[PDB]
Amino acid sequence: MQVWNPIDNPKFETLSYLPPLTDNQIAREIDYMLRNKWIPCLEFDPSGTITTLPGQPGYYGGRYWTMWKLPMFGCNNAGYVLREIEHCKNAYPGCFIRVLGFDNIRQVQCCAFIVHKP
Amino acid sequence: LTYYTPDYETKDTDILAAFRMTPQPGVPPEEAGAAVAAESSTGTWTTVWTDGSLDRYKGRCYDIEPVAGEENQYIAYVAYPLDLFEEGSVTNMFTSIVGNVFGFKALRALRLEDLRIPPAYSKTFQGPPHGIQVERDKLNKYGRPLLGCTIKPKLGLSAKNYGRAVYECLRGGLDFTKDDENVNSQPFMRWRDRFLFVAEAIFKSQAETGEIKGHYLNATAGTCEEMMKRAQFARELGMPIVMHDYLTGGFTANTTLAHYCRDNGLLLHIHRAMHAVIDRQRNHGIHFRVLAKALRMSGGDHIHSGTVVGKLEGEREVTLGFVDLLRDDYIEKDRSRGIYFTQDWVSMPGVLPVASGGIHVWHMPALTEIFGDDSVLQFGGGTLGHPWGNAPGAVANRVALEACVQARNEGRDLAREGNDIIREASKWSPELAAACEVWKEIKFVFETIDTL
Amino acid sequence: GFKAGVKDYRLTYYTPDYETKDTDILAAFRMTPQPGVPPEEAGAAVAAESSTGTWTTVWTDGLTSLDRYKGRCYDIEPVAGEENQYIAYVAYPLDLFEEGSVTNMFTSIVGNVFGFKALRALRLEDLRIPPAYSKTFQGPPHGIQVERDKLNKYGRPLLGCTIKPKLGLSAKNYGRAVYECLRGGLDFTKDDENVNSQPFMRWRDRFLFVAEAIFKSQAETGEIKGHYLNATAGTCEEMMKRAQFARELGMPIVMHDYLTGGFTANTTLAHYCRDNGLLLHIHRAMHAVIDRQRNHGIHFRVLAKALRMSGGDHIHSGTVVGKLEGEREVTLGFVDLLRDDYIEKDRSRGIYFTQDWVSMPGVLPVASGGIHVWHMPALTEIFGDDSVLQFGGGTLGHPWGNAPGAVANRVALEACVQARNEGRDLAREGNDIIREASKWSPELAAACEVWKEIK
Amino acid sequence: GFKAGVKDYRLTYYTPDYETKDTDILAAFRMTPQPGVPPEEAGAAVAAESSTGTWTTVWTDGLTSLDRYKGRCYDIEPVAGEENQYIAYVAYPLDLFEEGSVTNMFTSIVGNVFGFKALRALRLEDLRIPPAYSKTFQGPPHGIQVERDKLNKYGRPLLGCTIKPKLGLSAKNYGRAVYECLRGGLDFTKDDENVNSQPFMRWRDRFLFVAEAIFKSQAETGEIKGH
Amino acid sequence: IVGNVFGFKALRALRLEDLRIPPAYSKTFQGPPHGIQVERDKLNKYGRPLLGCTIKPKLGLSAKNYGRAVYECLRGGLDFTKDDENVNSQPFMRWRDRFLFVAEAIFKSQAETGEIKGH
Amino acid sequence: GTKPNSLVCANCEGEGCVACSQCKGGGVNLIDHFNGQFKAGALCWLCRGKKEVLCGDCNGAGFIGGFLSTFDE
Ligand SMILES: O=C(O)[C@@](O)(COP(=O)(O)O)[C@H](O)[C@H](O)COP(=O)(O)O
Ligand SMILES: [Mg+2]
Ligand SMILES: [Mg+2]
Structure with a gap:
């Protein structure tokens, strides 16, 4: 048998256990998102710590990030999204970057994953 | 006349x-x-x-x-x-x-x-305490079904040992853990120590990976006063969720608890025990589609819906029909699935379905097809029966689900091409290989008694 | 390994x-x-x-x-x-x-x-x-002997009646009928399982009017009378409120439904009733969905044991006179399981294990469902003087009104008890004793003209 | 967009x-x-x-x-x-x-x-x-039929009267007038919207005197009266 | 009168x-709870008029979205934020979840600028 | 007490109420019933001026099987 390393092994939610993602894989989900008529958006933050409170159920700290510009309404091509990512990477090179999606009919997000690490 | x-x-x-x-x-x-x-x-x-x-x-x-x-x-x-x-x-x-x-x-x-x-x-009526969207927003988890596991053996383990297993299971990659339904307070283990040890394990596991975790604490009791006493302690410790059986406990007690949970911001998980005594024969009793509606009216967040490939009865069409009556808002009439009347819920929240009962890795492709990414899947013996341990067992279950999610999104079939998705993924995962070798030819096929 | x-x-x-x-x-x-x-x-x-x-x-x-x-x-x-x-x-x-x-x-x-x-x-x-x-466990709140001491009634089975098809009635009309029936000569008076709180009648004023009627009916006769008040509700705060008000008015008995309400609420109510000195009446609804078919479900003799340990004083058990031989043995067995203290093994009566109760009180069985005056001696000879007999349309159907309806039942019951206490057989004579008692009570007559003999 | x-x-x-x-x-x-x-x-x-x-x-x-x-x-x-x-x-x-x-x-x-x-x-x-x-919503507490059943009055409209401008009056004088009017034969008796608690008359003793008058007026006639 | x-x-x-x-x-009578001077002393703001903003659209938004806007508005330089007068408790958003998300946004915004904020 | 292949009370034939016999459609005593306790002229000693009586079998139901005509068990 082997032992799972417990020391310095952080994880970042969805698609963090599969092998690293490539640019082809990246520009494959953006298309799946567009085929279902959803709205993309970008977010950035320099840390990922989680904090709790003494006796308040359902309260956690560290869930909100910072929005890049504004949600890309009326977007029908993927290319545009990839350019905006390079702009964000150039702007702040010491932060995490995330990609989101949105459904206005049920009022809820649909996917999220990381594309850059410090 | x-x-x-x-x-x-x-x-x-x-x-x-x-x-x-x-x-x-x-x-x-x-x-x-x-x-x-x-x-x-x-x-x-x-x-x-x-x-x-x-x-x-x-x-x-x-x-x-x-x-x-x-x-x-x-x-x-x-x-x-x-x-x-x-x-x-x-x-x-x-x-x-x-x-x-x-x-x-x-x-x-x-x-x-x-x-x-x-x-x-x-x-x-009041309805579910929170619903579907609010719970997802609270837990900060989007884009995939959730995972969980029950602890075994049932009856016989102490409190220190019970907590030592939750940590190893939780540290491996799962999201939730549960107590068996027949575990309230017994001579070999009382509840107030189990609560404390579980809380300590949850905190230690959360500090490590960096994601939010939880465990369903059982609150069934023999009197209303004890039942209400066992929830205030959970509120004090800061735990996020509790559990209750609504058919052997009562509808009067379930409604009192739902009110309390709405008042104090907790999540409620429901278990359907003894239901098979009422709805199994096809000529006497009450169908489950009626009890599901009654529970949605009374109040709850989760509910067991059963699998179709496990050790307990269940038919596809019928299931596909009552999962919508439980999740959707407006439902039309279709007798090919068992809908006799049209239903309008005038803006009332939905309920998450849950599937559990004798399932393993060679079942992910199907489960992911029958239910969307709006359900919870549970694996008890499929995790604590891995040749290595509980952490190695949990990792194998998460990798399979991630591979299945990526395949579908890339635009490939799941019914036709499923064994390949698993065989290809097992190449780079040393834990998934072991599990596949243990449970290769183990299925359940018998004649249905409640055809339609 | x-x-x-x-x-x-x-x-x-x-x-x-x-x-x-x-x-x-x-x-x-x-x-x-x-x-x-x-x-x-x-x-x-x-x-x-x-x-x-x-x-x-x-x-x-x-x-x-x-x-x-x-x-x-x-x-x-x-x-x-x-x-x-x-x-x-x-x-x-x-x-x-x-x-x-x-x-x-x-x-x-x-x-x-x-x-x-x-x-x-x-x-x-x-x-x-x-x-x-x-x-x-605690068991029944009071039992059998204590209840008889509280009510001061010995030697004969108790009588009762239920408000049959009479809904949509205002509270005052309900109280008037209750008073008439109680003054007639009966002991208890029931309600209706499907009556909790509805737009045509709320519960507080119905409680008030029933309580007003009970005292005024009690004053004229010098005997203890009561009436079951339904306490089943949707949460545990409403049930406790209704029980507390019923205690405040000084009523002697309440009623609950335990199959559709649950075990937890039933146990809480039993504890409260033991603490504050009240009697509990148990009604069994929806039971037929479980214990009817012969190859699937749970038999009723297990639910009876469960009810005995959770707590209760009265329980419904159904009639047994229209049962042919072979059958009614099961009913006689599971009545003994409810009343006795030591039951031996008997496969012919459907008993699988020997049961000891180590000094736990008993429960009074209740029989009901379409019964008239001509069924008095049979029910007296089967159950004995340790049961409650409930009459439905056999009381409100009299051609002269509600009050004379109870007099016929009272006279017939007293005549049957007197005949039994003399050595005469209540099984063979039967139809004959009723006729003699009818020759000095104009109310027993007229009733023996709407309802014919047995055979 | x-x-x-x-x-x-x-x-x-x-x-x-x-x-x-x-x-x-x-x-x-x-x-x-x-x-x-x-x-x-x-x-x-x-x-x-x-x-x-x-x-x-x-x-x-x-x-x-x-x-x-x-x-x-x-x-x-x-x-x-x-x-x-x-x-x-x-x-x-x-x-x-x-x-x-x-x-x-x-x-x-x-x-x-x-x-x-x-x-x-x-x-x-x-x-x-x-x-x-x-x-x-809940609506009215009792309604129309329930109130008539409570008061036991059928067939005719009810009667009432209101204390006219007699301000600056002590509690005893208020109760005396209330008793006289109730014994006269009426059913109800009102108050004055502009009377809550003032230096010339507080509320507790006014309540006490009105309650004392109601019973004594009720005893002589055998009918239900209120204020 | x-x-x-x-x-x-x-x-x-x-x-x-x-x-x-x-x-x-x-x-x-008792009068105002605190007044003018006491509030200025409590908030530690002297020299200029205060600023604020109300959230729109009125009726239609969830609780997570409502809180995401408060932060971006508060992090920009304002002092206060307000709920519309017709926002109480509705099927689309209950109050106990709004209160928690608003509190989290307020704390996160306060830790960044270096000044006292409210809603 | 049911008509051929039909859960309907044969006596009341789906009515619940039958006719008075003592007066046999009249509502007037035709003799001195009992013994000096009833005369031959006043209302019938039973229906008391109605010529009506509940049906013994169906207690006003019109049909048989039910919680008003059947036993229990
Ligand atoms: O107790 C059990 O057997 C389970 O934990 C499954 O355990 P394993 O997966 O370890 O066998 C679940 O409670 C059953 O699936 C309940 O069935 P249902 O969903 O029909 O209520
Ligand atoms: Mg289990
Ligand atoms: Mg406004």
């Missing part, structure tokens, strides 16, 4: 029901439907007792159909006035509709199939 | 030779398996997934020591006549249940075994409770 | 052809606008600043989906005789109100529209409450 | 304009 009005124009504030009946030889059908309606509402066809205005307090039959394929089977429709029921009480409704019609000696069998609740009666 | 994989159940859960202990719980189901499986595997499978078992071998079991915690099938018997039916017997250790909880026992013994894809039907028949698990 | 700037109201809040549903709340105001504005724009402005709307286009609206939540003017009729008077009709979805609260409905329907510098007058006339919003 | 004089028929209209309250009657 009287309790049978073959023209009555059903109103929009009435409650409708549909029974299937098996009359004795000789008894004409249009005579039995009238008897069922009378013996359910008042118990008479004459006016010898009235003249005291009545009529405005009686149910009437308004349609009859023959069942195709069977020579002795019929469907009867009955309508009830609105003023017969008390607002905000499921106990009353159940007592008034079903509480004397199942002993009638002129019949041989009876089964309730569906019910239609008007919006003028649904608005007097 | 740990060996990952799947194995059979009859390798650790079938103990043909095993000697039961005094502190054990025993059960008995009848089963009918699917084509392919040997009976031994089926029985073992049932006990396995109801105590401590899964489907694929776990490692956390080599640190708890089984053998001390595990159920065991120790006998299987074929059923004559049927081709695929057998009787199984399982034994359960005592350290697996929580003290004072019926919910835990019910959820452990029958929780998920009635829905396996390897069986086609199941039915529970009997249970044996050791005298070490019963001493942790 | 976002275009910063100001636009007209009659471009999203005027639906000439709309079929109302059975779970909708309906209203009817009569209006008289200022010289310059067409009636349609006026009606649309009322519906907007009472449901969901501002004055300069916001971006957070492309994530909530309107059409589901929004008021709509669906008819306008001129008032005969008058030269500048019209009747409007607005419809309100049911998911905009809180159950069991009259304050919320009143503050939503009429909150800030009676003070816009584009109208000169407004008046609300009627409202239609669906049978799905009313079932969440 | 006003409860019957506005139905007099012998008149056509009536309007109350002003009142004078003597000090012997004002001393029996």
Whole structure:
């Protein structure tokens, strides 16, 4: 048998256990998102710590990030999204970057994953 | 002739029901439907007792159909006035509709199939405490189904040992853990120590990976005071979720708890125990599609819906029909799945379905097809039975799900091409390989007793 | 060592030779398996997934020591006549249940075994409770002797009536009828299970009017009278409020529904009734959905035992006169299970285990459902003077009104009791004694003209 | 998708052809606008600043989906005789109100529209409450039949009287007059809206004296009396 | 003072304009809870008028979205934020979830700028 | 007490109320019933001026099987 390393092994939610993602894989989900008529958006933050409170159920700290510009309404091509990512990477090179999606009919997000690490 | 009005124009504030009946030889059908309606509402066809205005307090039959394929089977429709029921009480409704019609000696069998609740009666209930969207926003998890596991063996383990397993299981990659339904307070382990050890394990596991974790704490008791005492401690410690059995406990106790959970911001998980005593035979009892509606009205966040490839009975079509009646908002009528009436929920939150009962890695592709990414999957023996341990077992379960999610999104089939998705993923994962070798040829196939 | 994989159940859960202990719980189901499986595997499978078992071998079991915690099938018997039916017997250790909880026992013994894809039907028949698990319960609030002392009524069965088809009535009209019936000569008066709080009648004013009627009816006759008030509700705060108001008005008895309300609320109500000095009446609704069919469900004699330990004073049991030979033996047996203190084994009466109750009080049975004056001697001779007889349309159907209707029943009951206390046989004479008593009561006559003789 | 700037109201809040549903709340105001504005724009402005709307286009609206939540003017009729008077009709979805609260409905329907510098007058006339919003209220405590049963009086209207201007009176003199009037033969006896607690008479002793008078008046006649 | 004089028929209209309250009657009331000086001392802001903003659209947004806007607005330089007057408790958003998300946004915004904020 | 292949009370034939015999459609005593306790002229000693009586079998139901005509068990 082997032992799972417990020391310095952080994880970042969805698609963090599969092998690293490539640019082809990246520009494959953006298309799946567009085929279902959803709205993309970008977010950035320099840390990922989680904090709790003494006796308040359902309260956690560290869930909100910072929005890049504004949600890309009326977007029908993927290319545009990839350019905006390079702009964000150039702007702040010491932060995490995330990609989101949105459904206005049920009022809820649909996917999220990381594309850059410090 | 009287309790049978073959023209009555059903109103929009009435409650409708549909029974299937098996009359004795000789008894004409249009005579039995009238008897069922009378013996359910008042118990008479004459006016010898009235003249005291009545009529405005009686149910009437308004349609009859023959069942195709069977020579002795019929469907009867009955309508009830609105003023017969008390607002905000499921106990009353159940007592008034079903509480004397199942002993009638002129019949041989009876089964309730569906019910239609008007919006003028649904608005007097509270409903689920939080719903679907609010829970996802609270937990900060999007884009994939959630995972969980139950602890075994049931009955026999201490509190320190119980907590040592939760940590190793939770540290591996799962999201939730659960106590068996028959674990309340026993001589070998009392509840107040189990709570503390579980809390310590949860904190230690959360500090490591960097994601939010939880565990369902059982709150069933023998008296209401004890049941309410066992929830204030969970509120004090800061735990996010609790569990309750609603069929052996009661509807009165479930409603009191739902109110408390809404007041103090907790999440409620429900277990369906003893239900198989009522809905397994196809000619006597009450279908589950009715109990599911009743629970959605009473209050809850999760509910067990069963698998289709496990160790317990369950048919695809029927399931696909009641999972929408539980998740959706407006549902049309389709008899190819078991919907007899149209339903409108006038903006009432939904309920997450759960699947569990003898399942392993060679079942992910199907489960992911039948249910979308709006469910929870549980694996008890599939995790604690891995040749290595609990952490190695949990990692193998998460990798399979991630591979399945990526495949579908890339636009590939899952029914046709599923074994490949698993075989290709096992190449780079040393933990997934071991599990696949242990449970290769283990399936469950028998004849269905509740066909349709 | 740990060996990952799947194995059979009859390798650790079938103990043909095993000697039961005094502190054990025993059960008995009848089963009918699917084509392919040997009976031994089926029985073992049932006990396995109801105590401590899964489907694929776990490692956390080599640190708890089984053998001390595990159920065991120790006998299987074929059923004559049927081709695929057998009787199984399982034994359960005592350290697996929580003290004072019926919910835990019910959820452990029958929780998920009635829905396996390897069986086609199941039915529970009997249970044996050791005298070490019963001493942790409270039982009925008062019992039989204490209630009779409280009411000061000896020697004869009690009488009662129910407000039949008469809904949509205002509170005042309800109270008037209650007063008339009580002044007639009866003892108790019921309500209607489907009446809690509705737009045509709320509960507080109905309570007020009934309480007003009871005292004024009591003053003129000098006897203790009562009326059952329904306390079933949607939450636990409403039920407690109604019980507290009923106590505040000084009423002697309440009523609850325990199959559609639940066990937890019933136990809470029983504790409150014991604490504050009230009587509890239990009605059984929806029971026919479980205990009717012969090859699936739960028999009523188990629910009777469950109700005895949770707590209650009266319970419905149905009529037994229209039962032919062979039958009605089961009813006579499970009445004895409710009233007696020590019951021996008898297979002809449907008793599977010997039961000891170590000084627990009894419960009064109740009979009802379409009965008239001509059925008096039979019911007196079957049950004895330890029951309650409820009349429906046989009281409100009199051609002269409600008050004269009760006089006929009272006269007939007194005549039957007097005839029994003299040596005359109440089974053969029967129709003859009623006629003689009818020759000096104009109200017994007229009633003997609407309702004909037996045969 | 976002275009910063100001636009007209009659471009999203005027639906000439709309079929109302059975779970909708309906209203009817009569209006008289200022010289310059067409009636349609006026009606649309009322519906907007009472449901969901501002004055300069916001971006957070492309994530909530309107059409589901929004008021709509669906008819306008001129008032005969008058030269500048019209009747409007607005419809309100049911998911905009809180159950069991009259304050919320009143503050939503009429909150800030009676003070816009584009109208000169407004008046609300009627409202239609669906049978799905009313079932969440309790209503009168007893009603009509229950009160008559409680008082045991049938066949005729009830009688009453009110203490006329006799202020600056002590409690005993108040009770004496109450007793006299009740013994006369009436049923009820009122008080005075402008009498709560004042230096010349506090409330507890007035309650005591009235309660003393009621019983003694009741004993002599054998009928139920109140105050 | 006003409860019957506005139905007099012998008149056509009536309007109350002003009142004078003597000090012997004002001393029996409590008055404002804190006032003007105490609030400025509590908030530690002196020299200029304060600023604020209301959230739109009115009726239609969820609780997570409502809180995401408060932060971006508060992090920019304002002092206060407000709920519309018709926002109480509705099927689309309950109050106990709004309160928690607003509190989290307020704390996160306060930790960044370096000044006291509120809603 | 049911008509051929029909759960209907044969006596009341779906009515619940039958005719008075003592007066046999009359509502007037035709003899001195009992013994000096009833005369031959006043209302019938039973229906007391109605010529009506509840049906013994169905207690006003019109049909048989039910919680008003059947036993229990
Ligand atoms: O107790 C059990 O058997 C389970 O934990 C499954 O365990 P394994 O997965 O370890 O076998 C679940 O409670 C059952 O699936 C309940 O069935 P249902 O969902 O029909 O209520
Ligand atoms: Mg389990
Ligand atoms: Mg505003």
